[PDB]
Design a protein around this nucleic acid. Structure first.
Ligand code: OIY
Ligand code: OIY
Lengths: 60, 78, 103, 91, 44
RNA sequence: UGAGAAGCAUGCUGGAGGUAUCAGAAGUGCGAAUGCUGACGUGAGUAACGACAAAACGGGUGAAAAACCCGUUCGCCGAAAGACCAAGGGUUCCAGUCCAACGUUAAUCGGGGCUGGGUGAGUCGACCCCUAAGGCGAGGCCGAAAGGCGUAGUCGAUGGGA
RNA sequence: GAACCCACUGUCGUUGAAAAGCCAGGGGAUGACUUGUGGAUAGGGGUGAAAGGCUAAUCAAGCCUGGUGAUAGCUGGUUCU
RNA sequence: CUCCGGGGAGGCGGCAAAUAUCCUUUGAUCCGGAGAUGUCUGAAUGGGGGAACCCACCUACUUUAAGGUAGGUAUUGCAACAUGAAUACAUAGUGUUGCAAGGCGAACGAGGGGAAGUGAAACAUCUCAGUACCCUUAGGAAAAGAAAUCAAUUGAGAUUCCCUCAGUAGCGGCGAGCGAACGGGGAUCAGCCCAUUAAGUUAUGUGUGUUUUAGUGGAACGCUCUGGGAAGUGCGAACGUAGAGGGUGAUAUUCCCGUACACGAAAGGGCACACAUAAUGAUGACGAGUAGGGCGAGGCACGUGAAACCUUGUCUGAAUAUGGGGGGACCAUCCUCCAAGGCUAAAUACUCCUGACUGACCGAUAGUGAACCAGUACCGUGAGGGAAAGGCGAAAAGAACCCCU
């Protein structure tokens, strides 16, 4: 999804990063409680945060 | 920070004591070092140097100002 | 040469020599062919998942050098070469030169 | 105290008899937290991400166990636990 | 009866510790030898 | 079979290498060196089972109970064989489960194996402020080099500070 | 005269419970006393109310690594026909 | 994690199977190049400290509470600027900014110090030996180097390395031992300057050539017998610029990976040559406290010897081209060179590491201490010492189920 990410602005990317970090926390809590059956969700959130930070470094 | 002549660079050197039975033991030869104050007229002050008597003879032959300039050129604080 | 998952091969070495079938998987230099090289596995019951055990028959892998691609036209073992027909690399039978039938 | 650190402070709830009794009787939440988290950070994270009021936080660190598995020895990491007391009846 | 080893962690570290070894050139040579030999633990 | 170091044939085991002849090169031959490494004997089912404070019975569980649990008796310590702190150790703490090895016997028991829990501080201690002995030490003095000593300082509790 | 610090006598122990002890007696016990913590002195050196004592179960010259495969007119051993 | 290139059907690293969620022809896993991120300790550099910890200060932005983000704050040396005592001018001292250095690591190089065991059948001169070891400091090499050199028909012609000369001439309690040179044959070859200043070297940029970091294609075998299995037997066939090697159920040129050969690069790196600009060479202009001498030592194969020559701790001390040094005491004559100022490639020394290939080298008590989770377990306060331990089967097809316990 890096091609879709690259078509956005720095300010949009920072909001996306905040949303993804909150979502990662929620996924971690759900897994810890045991309500989550899909761990690829947390893997995708982790990789998405990494991609957003890479794109921010590239764009700034 | 050593026994080194500021003018000539002389320093202790190693050698042997040789007895009448030709036993050899290590020794050192030390330079005739001492401190001496020299009037520097261009700078209106005494400069204190650690030097040998041979360095004193060199200063006698060449003048204090030339020797001081040479030491400064070699990079000494005089 | 190359042998892929969907191909139709014939066994040229081992106890299954002469038999033919469709390959199920390729991994490293071992290949599994449907219905060939069967072993009997004595399976103990799996306590957590129930699954009362028994003697089951499954396939065992053969070395890839022991199978040959089957030529549909001649029903004979053949070798695989490469040719750039038009602008794409394709597999071809060495004996005849025609392209390899797709699964 | 920024959002990135707030989202990292808390790790998960603790499931045990002591934690369950504390929650059922005294209204206390037991959390696993970052080894470097402070009491102020834990309080801010809890109030932000759960919308409750915190009166005080108690923390404790349990050193990891060294155990032999197979022929090789190993050690588990240290765990820090937070006992978060909530105001009146909440959560 | 009293034996020779009477442990004290502070004395152990101040006599044989990393900074004690680094404080002198001979201690640094000790560290170099242990690194060259490949010791898993350099100091006490 | 030959005078010998040895050779040849073949039964059984074993499951993939071996090698004529003639030359060529040697980590080329072991019984001893109180030789070196590993394995196994004799002594011999012999000595010993680690404070001479001491045990007895009923019931339980268990494949099995002198040693575990419950109960009823007996005995020993009580300026320590009781209760704490520092140092030192590091999970030995608690619960469930197991008994091969560990426990100088057996063990259902354990400081043993496995699994899961457990250490909550403004007031206790440390950290922190302060310094002793002593250590290090900008410049500095001294020394072939490495280095020695030392000023201003800076550390250092076994002591002072809610 | 207890604690505490010592070690004069005897039995036992000597492949010990212990590479210096137990037991029964014994000496000092407000002093040149005993003791915790942390420091200083390093090998022909230190320290010693002095025994060549002690300096990590090692002391008429500690331990470790190098010179080093020291040298040994001495002892032992030296392999099939 | 991103981009560029390769590749084309599987993949989510190993012990280590299974399991789930899954990813992937809208091109995954994987391979090469270039970027992004990169906690704490450690030269460790904001202060401290028992390494991986404790405590800070100053700017700018941000927040309302008790915080966050980014940057700066070590020492020494040099340069510039500012400030500034005794003390009048100054100097010392102080501060800021900029630049540089420190630490680690095989061997080889250069320099500063420097043993004893041993041999002499004892031992002191001597030997061991400028060895072991300690210390300082470079480079891809270093050092040396262009005659104040040898030679002795008046000839050679800068350094360095190899073979001879030769165990010769000599030195030596004339013992034990130490041990040249001249000349000849080779390797490599190269000279250039002292103030308008050379050869050369180092940087940056440009151009050209080559090399290197992924990869693609790559020939040709059937029947029969034994056998669990054929690559082995028997009978015929094909390729070869490919019969190197490895694997496949026993021994394969023709089954697989490969081999000979022919191709291949977005992007990056190395080297060589040519120009451009810097900078260096290069504080030095023919060499005075120098040559020589007295005293004490050291180096020369050369131990004070008939002892020349080189270095100097101490005391002295010229002439200066009608001049000076050497030719092994010394004198005369002849011959030869020009010290007291510099730079310079190759032939030479080595292997921590990278790629390819090789062995009348070892095959688990061998070969590295270590084929295996080894500098580990274990021992020691510490420096330090230091092991043992490889093999089911082609494939787990690793023994469902029954019986004793
Ligand atoms: N920091 C140092 C302090 C120095 C101090 N001031 C002492 C001093 O000033 N000078 C010391 C001498 C230094 C010299 N280099 C030593 C030397 O060269 N010896 C030579 C030894 C030769 C040989 N190996 C043994 C030998 O034959 N020996 C003899 C003799 O046995 C000895 O008698 C003793 N020995 O008992 C002495 C008579 O007494 O004569 C010796 N023979 C000789 N002696 C003379 C001499 O020296 N020169 C001139 C000539 O005459 C020499 N021949
Ligand atoms: C050589 N010739 C002269 C020369 O050019 N440089 C070195 C000058 C040394 C000379 N001995 C004078 C000196 O300063 N001695 C000190 C001294 O021994 C000691 O200090 C104290 N306080 O006792 C030591 C503590 O480390 O530090 C040294 N000095 C240091 N300077 C060094 C540095 O920066 N790096 C490396 C290491 O050499 C460091 N040691």
């Amino acid at each position: 999804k890096t091609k879709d990410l690259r078509e956005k602005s720095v300010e949009e990317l920072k909001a996306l990063l905040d949303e993804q970090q909150l979502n990662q926390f929620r996924l971690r809590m759900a897994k810890a409680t045991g309500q989550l059956g899909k761990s690829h969700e947390v893997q995708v959130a982790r990789k998405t945060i990494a991609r957003i930070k890479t794109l921010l470094t590239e764009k700034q | 920070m050593s026994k080194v002549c500021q003018v000539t660079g002389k320093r202790p050197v190693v050698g042997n004591n040789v007895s009448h039975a030709n036993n050899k033991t290590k020794r050192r030869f030390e330079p005739n070092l001492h401190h001496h104050r020299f009037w520097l007229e261009s700078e209106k002050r005494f400069v204190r140097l650690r030097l040998t008597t041979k360095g004193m003879r060199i200063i006698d032959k060449l003048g204090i100002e030339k020797v001081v300039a040479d030491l400064r050129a070699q990079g000494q604080k005089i | 040469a190359k042998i892929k998952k969907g191909d139709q091969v014939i066994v040229i070495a081992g106890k299954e020599k002469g038999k033919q079938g469709t390959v199920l998987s390729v991994s490293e230099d071992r290949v599994k062919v449907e219905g060939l090289n069967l072993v009997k596995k004595h399976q103990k019951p799996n306590r957590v998942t129930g699954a009362e055990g028994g003697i089951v028959t499954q396939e065992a892998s053969l070395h890839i050098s022991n199978v040959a691609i089957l030529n549909a036209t001649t029903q004979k073992a053949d070798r695989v070469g490469y040719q750039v027909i038009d602008g794409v690399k394709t597999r071809v039978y060495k004996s005849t030169g025609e392209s390899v039938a797709v699964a | 105290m920024n959002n990135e650190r707030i989202y990292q402070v808390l790790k998960g709830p603790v499931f045990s008899e002591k934690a369950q009794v504390l929650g059922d009787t005294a209204g206390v939440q037991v959390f696993k937290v970052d080894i470097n988290a402070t009491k102020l950070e834990i309080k801010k994270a809890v109030e932000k991400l759960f919308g409750v009021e915190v009166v005080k936080v108690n923390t404790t660190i349990t050193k990891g166990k060294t155990k032999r598995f197979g022929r090789t020895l190993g050690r588990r990491s240290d765990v820090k636990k937070a006992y978060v007391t909530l105001k009146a009846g909440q959560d | 009866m009293k034996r020779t080893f009477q442990p004290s962690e502070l004395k152990r570290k101040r006599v044989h510790g990393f900074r004690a070894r680094m404080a002198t050139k001979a201690g640094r040579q000790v560290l170099a030898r242990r690194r060259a030999k490949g010791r898993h633990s350099l100091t006490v």
